[PDB]
Design a protein around this ligand. Structure first.
Ligand SMILES: CCCCCCCCCCCCCCCCCCCCCCCCCC(=O)N[C@@H](CC[C@H]1O[C@H](CO)[C@H](O)[C@H](O)[C@H]1O)[C@H](O)[C@H](O)CCCCCCCCCCCCCC
Ligand SMILES: *[C@@H]1O[C@H](CO[C@@H]2O[C@@H](C)[C@@H](O)[C@@H](O)[C@@H]2O)[C@@H](O[C@@H]2O[C@H](CO)[C@@H](O)[C@H](O)[C@H]2NC(C)=O)[C@H](O)[C@H]1NC(C)=O
Ligand SMILES: *[C@@H]1O[C@H](CO)[C@@H](O)[C@H](O)[C@H]1NC(C)=O
Ligand SMILES: *[C@@H]1O[C@H](CO)[C@@H](O)[C@H](O)[C@H]1NC(C)=O
Lengths: 96, 239, 203, 266
C-alpha cells in the first residue's frame, strides 16, 4: 500500500464571482481503487469530471478531477478522498 | 508418455461411493478428468495443477477430486446417481498444450443390484464340413445369462491372446427383450486354418471377464454372490 | 456448443475416400487436433494443425485447417475396414497448459469390407463339453446380405460381423444362431433372412 | 524524442471479479482510452489511428480484443497454479511501447508489474523475470514461454508494429504535438510568496523570483501538475521576512511567448 497525495488548484487566476475550473490531482497511491469527491462547503458537487486513471514510471497511480466552479468570498471548496491505505478519508481544502 | 486408469470398468449402485483413479509416471504437473456421453463431446469435470490442488471444471457437480501426489489424480463420487453412467477419461500434461489420455473407464450406476448375474460360457468346436469345404475352422463362443452388459470377451491360444481372425458382436443381445431387467447373451467367432485347429497341441480358450459386485458390496440374496470374475471355456485342437 | 462435426455419421465401401468436417467458434484457436476412437476404446491422435492455413498428412489421413473460416476437413484416402471408428475434433484455446480443449461429438464412420470370394454356407458346431448343445454359423456371405432376426422368440440370431485373418489377407462375414430347444435345426435357422440361392447346407 | 506508452491496469479482487483498463500516451498527450466497460478501444485524438487503414486497425483492435479476454483468464489460472502461493487481491500493470529516435531507430519495451513491483519483461523472443523477482514466478514464465504463437505475435508487436505505428502517429499528430499554448501567471502569499503559472504547453518552462535582475536562490519549484485541457500548471515558492515584499516580481520564460517574458510585479 501507498498513501495518496492530493493537490487543489485552479485553471485560471481566481477572481470572485467569475466562472473558473477547480482541479484536484491525486497521486502516489496503490492499489488503484479510490473514492474521490469534490466538495463545496462539505456538500458533494454533482457535475464532476474524471480523467482516465494512469500511472507513472514508479508504477504508482494518478488521476485528475476537475469541476466548474465560481469562486466567492464566503464559499469553501475541497477534495475528499477514500483509499485502503487510509483509516479516515483525507480532506484537502482549496486555498489561493 | 503413458497414462493408466483404474478400474477399467465398474458396476455401482445408487448412493454408493465410487472412486475412479488415474496414474502417470511422466512427472506431469497437470491432470484432468473428463466424461464422454453419446451426442456430446468430452466434458471437463475437475482438474489439477499439482499435489494438493483440485480445481472445478465445467460440470463439477456430483464429483469431488483428489490429488494426493504428483502421480495420482482421483475422481470421487460420494453418492453415485444413474446420470453418472458414462465413460470417464483421465489426462495429463506438462506446460505444453498436449494432453495425454488414459484408456478410459466405463461406469454403470444402477438403481439396484438384485439382477446382477455372471455369465455362463460355452465353446463350440468347428464344423467338420466347414474344415473340408474351406480349409478353415471357425470356433464359436457363447456368454449367456449375464447382467449387466459389462463383459470383455477375449480369445487365447496357448496362453497368449489372439486378435487375428477374431470377431465379437458389437453389442450383446437381450435374451428376454420384454424385460426392464433382462439378462444378456453375447457371441464371438475365431477362425483359424484347418492345420492349426487339427493340431492336438493347440489349446483354445474363450474368456469372459465379467464386471459385477466387489467384495465390499452387500448381498442379501440366497444364491452365490455375483462378484467381478472370469468365466472361461476351453478346447484342444483335434485331428 | 463451440465445435461442430459433419456428417454426423456415414457409410462407405472399402477403397472409397471420405471427407470429414469440423466447424468451430472457439476463440482464440491455437491448434486443432483430429482423433480416431474405436468403439469402447481410447483416443488415438491422427494429426494436429497449427498454422493460419495449415495442411498435414499421416499415411492415408490428410487434413487442412483454415483459421479465418474457422474450419477443418479430414480426408481419408482408400478406406480400409479398420477405419470403422468415431472421428473426433478438438480445438485448443492456448499454445500452453493454460488452455481448455473443446470437443466435437464426433463423426461415426462405417467402412463396408469388399468380400472377394463369397462361399455362403450354414454350419452346425457342437459344444465341447456337450454332445447335445449346438450353434448354427451362417458364414462367408457378401456384404449385400441382410441377416434378420427370426420369428421365434426363443431363437437367437446375432447380427453380422467381419473377421480378418490378417496373415492371409482374408476376410469373412458371419452370423451365429441358436435356440434353447432340443429339436431346432440349421436349415430352419435363417428362414426369416433373405439368403443367397448358393448357400451350402451340408449333411 | 517521443515515448509511446500503453499502460494497462488489471485488478483481480477474488476468483470471480476483475476489471482491466488501458490508456495510451505519446509523450504527455493521451492518444487512446480503453475501458473495461467498452468492447472497443476509443480514440482520444482525431489522429489516433495514425497512418493505418481501417482494415489494418480493425485487425489490430481485434487482436487486443482477444488478448484482454485471454489475459484475464490466464492470470486467473496462473493463480490456481501457484495457490496457495499467492492470493487475491491481485494487481497487474503492463507498460509497453517504444522510445522513438531520429531516422529509423527505436527500442521497444514490455514491462510487467505485480502488486506494484516490476517483475517480468518480454525481452528478445521470450518472457523473463527481472532481478529481485520471486522464484515462484519461474513456473508462470515456463508456461508463458511454452506458448510459441504468443511469442511470434509479441515479437511482431514490439519489433515491427510499434515503431511503424508511431512513426505514423507523429505525422498525423504533428499539429497537436507541436502546439504552443501560453502560460498565464498570478501571485499570492501565505504565512512565503507564491507564483502561480498555468496553461503553458509544452512542459519545458522556467520560473524564478527576481528583484530587478537578480535571481532569488531560495525559489522552490513545485511539481508539474496537469490541467484538464492538456496544458500544464506549476508554482514557485520563496520564503520572505514580512515587509520585504517590495520591488519583487515573478519572471517566467516559455517557448510560447517568443522572448516576451512574463513580468508580474508585487
Ligand atoms: C504493444 C506496443 C504496440 C501497440 C501499438 C498499437 C497501439 C494501440 C494500442 C491501444 C490498446 C491498448 C492496450 C494496451 C495493453 C497492453 C498491451 C501489451 C501487449 C500484450 C501482448 C499480447 C499479444 C497477443 C497474444 C495473446 O493474445 N495471447 C493470449 C492468447 C494467445 C492464444 O492465441 C493466439 C492466437 O490468437 C496464439 O495462437 C497463441 O499461441 C494462443 O495461446 C494469452 O492469454 C497470453 O498468454 C496473454 C499475455 C499476457 C501477458 C503476460 C505477462 C506476464 C504476467 C505474469 C504474472 C503472473 C501472475 C500469476 C499469479
Ligand atoms: C525481435 O527482436 C529481437 C531482438 O530485439 C530485442 O528484443 C525485442 C523484444 C525488443 O525489446 C527490442 O527492442 C530488443 O532490442 C530478436 O531476438 C533475437 O533473436 C535472435 C534469433 O532468434 C537471438 O539469437 C537473440 O538472442 C535475440 N536477441 C535478444 C536480445 O534476445 C527477435 O528475433 C526479433 N524477432 C523478429 C520477428 O524480428
Ligand atoms: C468479490 O469482489 C468484489 C469487489 O471487491 C465484491 O463486491 C464481491 O462481493 C466479492 N465477492 C466474493 C464472493 O468474493
Ligand atoms: C469487465 O469486463 C468483463 C467483460 O467485458 C466482464 O465480464 C466483467 O464483469 C467486467 N468487470 C466489471 C467490474 O465490470
Amino acid at each position: 500500500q501507498k498513501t495518496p497525495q492530493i493537490q487543489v488548484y485552479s485553471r485560471h487566476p481566481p477572481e470572485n464571482g467569475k466562472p473558473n475550473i477547480l482541479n484536484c490531482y491525486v497521486t502516489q497511491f496503490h492499489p488503484p481503487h479510490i473514492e474521490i469527491q469534490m466538495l463545496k462547503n462539505g456538500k458533494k458537487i454533482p457535475k464532476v469530471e474524471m480523467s482516465d486513471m494512469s500511472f507513472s514510471k514508479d508504477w504508482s497511480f494518478y488521476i485528475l478531477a476537475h469541476t466548474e466552479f465560481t469562486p466567492t468570498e464566503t464559499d469553501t471548496y475541497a477534495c475528499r478522498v477514500k483509499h485502503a491505505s487510509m483509516a479516515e478519508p483525507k480532506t484537502v481544502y482549496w486555498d489561493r | 508418455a503413458a497414462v493408466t486408469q483404474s478400474p477399467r470398468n465398474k458396476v455401482a449402485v445408487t448412493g454408493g461411493k465410487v472412486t475412479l483413479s488415474c496414474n502417470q509416471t511422466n512427472n506431469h504437473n497437470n491432470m484432468y478428468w473428463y466424461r464422454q456421453d453419446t451426442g456430446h463431446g468430452l466434458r471437463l469435470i475437475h482438474y489439477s495443477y499439482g499435489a494438493g490442488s483440485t480445481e472445478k471444471g465445467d460440470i463439477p457437480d456430483g464429483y469431488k477430486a483428489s490429488r494426493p501426489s504428483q502421480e495420482n489424480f482421483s475422481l470421487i463420487l460420494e453418492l453415485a446417481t444413474p446420470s453418472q453412467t458414462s465413460v470417464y477419461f483421465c489426462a495429463s500434461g506438462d506446460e505444453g498444450y498436449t494432453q495425454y489420455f488414459g484408456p478410459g473407464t466405463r461406469l454403470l450406476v444402477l438403481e439396484d443390484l438384485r439382477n446382477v448375474t455372471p455369465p455362463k460360457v460355452s465353446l463350440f468346436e468347428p464344423s467338420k464340413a466347414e474344415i473340408s469345404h474351406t480349409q478353415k475352422a471357425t470356433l464359436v463362443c457363447l456368454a449367456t445369462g449375464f447382467y449387466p452388459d459389462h463383459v470383455e470377451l477375449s480369445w487365447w491360444v496357448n496362453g497368449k491372446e489372439v486378435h487375428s481372425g477374431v470377431c465379437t458382436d458389437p453389442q450383446p443381445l437381450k435374451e428376454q427383450p420384454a424385460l426392464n431387467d433382462s439378462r444378456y447373451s453375447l457371441s464371438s467367432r475365431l477362425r483359424v486354418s484347418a492345420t492349426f485347429w487339427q493340431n492336438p497341441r493347440n489349446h483354445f480358450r474363450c474368456q469372459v471377464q465379467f464386471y459385477g459386485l466387489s467384495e465390499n458390496d452387500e448381498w442379501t440374496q440366497d444364491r452365490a454372490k455375483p462378484v467381478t470374475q472370469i468365466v472361461s471355456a476351453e478346447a484342444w485342437g483335434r485331428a | 456448443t463451440q465445435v461442430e462435426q459433419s456428417p454426423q455419421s456415414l457409410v462407405v465401401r472399402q477403397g472409397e475416400n471420405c471427407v470429414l468436417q469440423c466447424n468451430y467458434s472457439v476463440t482464440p484457436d491455437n491448434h486443432l487436433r483430429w482423433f480416431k476412437q474405436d468403439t469402447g476404446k481410447g483416443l488415438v491422435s491422427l494429426t494436429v494443425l497449427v498454422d493460419q492455413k495449415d495442411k498435414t498428412s499421416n499415411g492415408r489421413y490428410s487434413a487442412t485447417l483454415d483459421k479465418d473460416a474457422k474450419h477443418s476437413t479430414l480426408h481419408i484416402t482408400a478406406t480400409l475396414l479398420d477405419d470403422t471408428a468415431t472421428y473426433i475434433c478438438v480445438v485448443g484455446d492456448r499454445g500452453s497448459a493454460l488452455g481448455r480443449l473443446h470437443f466435437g461429438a464426433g463423426t461415426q464412420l462405417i467402412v463396408i469390407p469388399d468380400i472377394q470370394n463369397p462361399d455362403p454356407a450354414v454350419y452346425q458346431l457342437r459344444d465341447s463339453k456337450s454332445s447335445d448343445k449346438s450353434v448354427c454359423l451362417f458364414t462367408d456371405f457378401d456384404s449385400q446380405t441382410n441377416v434378420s432376426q427370426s420369428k421365434d422368440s426363443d431363437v437367437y440370431i446375432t447380427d453380422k460381423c467381419v473377421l480378418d485373418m490378417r496373415s492371409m489377407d482374408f476376410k469373412s462375414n458371419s452370423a451365429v444362431a441358436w435356440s434353447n430347444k432340443s429339436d431346432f435345426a440349421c436349415a430352419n435357422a435363417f428362414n426369416n433372412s433373405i439368403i443367397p440361392e448358393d448357400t451350402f447346407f451340408p449333411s | 524524442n517521443y515515448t509511446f506508452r500503453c499502460l494497462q491496469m488489471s485488478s483481480f479482487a477474488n476468483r470471480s471479479w476483475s476489471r482491466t483498463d488501458s490508456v495510451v500516451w505519446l509523450g504527455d498527450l493521451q492518444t487512446h482510452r480503453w475501458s473495461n466497460d467498452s468492447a472497443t478501444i476509443s480514440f482520444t485524438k482525431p489522429w489516433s489511428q495514425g497512418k493505418l487503414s481501417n482494415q489494418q486497425w480493425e485487425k489490430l483492435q481485434h487482436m487486443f480484443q482477444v488478448y484482454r479476454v485471454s489475459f484475464t483468464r490466464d492470470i486467473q489460472e496462473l493463480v490456481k497454479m501457484m495457490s496457495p502461493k499467492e492470493d487475491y487481491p491481485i494487481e497487474i500493470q503492463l507498460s509497453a511501447g517504444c522510445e522513438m529516435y531520429p531516422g529509423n531507430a527505436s527500442e521497444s519495451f514490455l514491462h510487467v508489474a505485480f502488486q506494484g513491483k516490476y517483475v517480468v519483461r518480454f525481452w528478445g523472443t521470450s518472457w523473463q523475470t527481472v532481478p529481485g523477482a520471486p522464484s515462484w514466478l519461474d513456473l508462470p514464465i515456463k508456461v508463458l514461454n511454452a506458448d510459441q504463437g504468443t511469442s511470434a505475435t509479441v515479437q511482431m508487436l514490439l519489433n515491427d508494429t510499434c515503431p511503424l505505428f508511431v512513426r505514423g502517429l507523429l505525422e498525423a499528430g504533428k499539429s497537436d504535438l507541436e502546439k504552443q499554448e501560453k502560460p498565464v501567471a498570478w501571485l499570492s502569499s501565505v504565512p512565503q510568496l507564491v507564483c502561480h503559472v498555468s496553461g503553458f504547453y509544452p512542459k519545458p518552462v522556467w520560473v524564478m523570483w527576481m528583484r530587478g535582475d537578480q535571481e532569488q536562490q531560495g525559489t522552490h519549484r513545485g511539481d508539474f501538475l496537469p490541467n484538464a485541457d492538456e496544458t500544464w500548471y506549476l508554482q514557485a515558492t520563496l520564503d520572505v521576512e514580512a515587509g520585504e515584499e517590495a520591488g519583487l516580481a515573478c519572471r517566467v520564460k516559455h517557448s510560447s511567448l517568443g522572448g516576451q517574458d512574463i513580468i508580474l510585479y508585487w
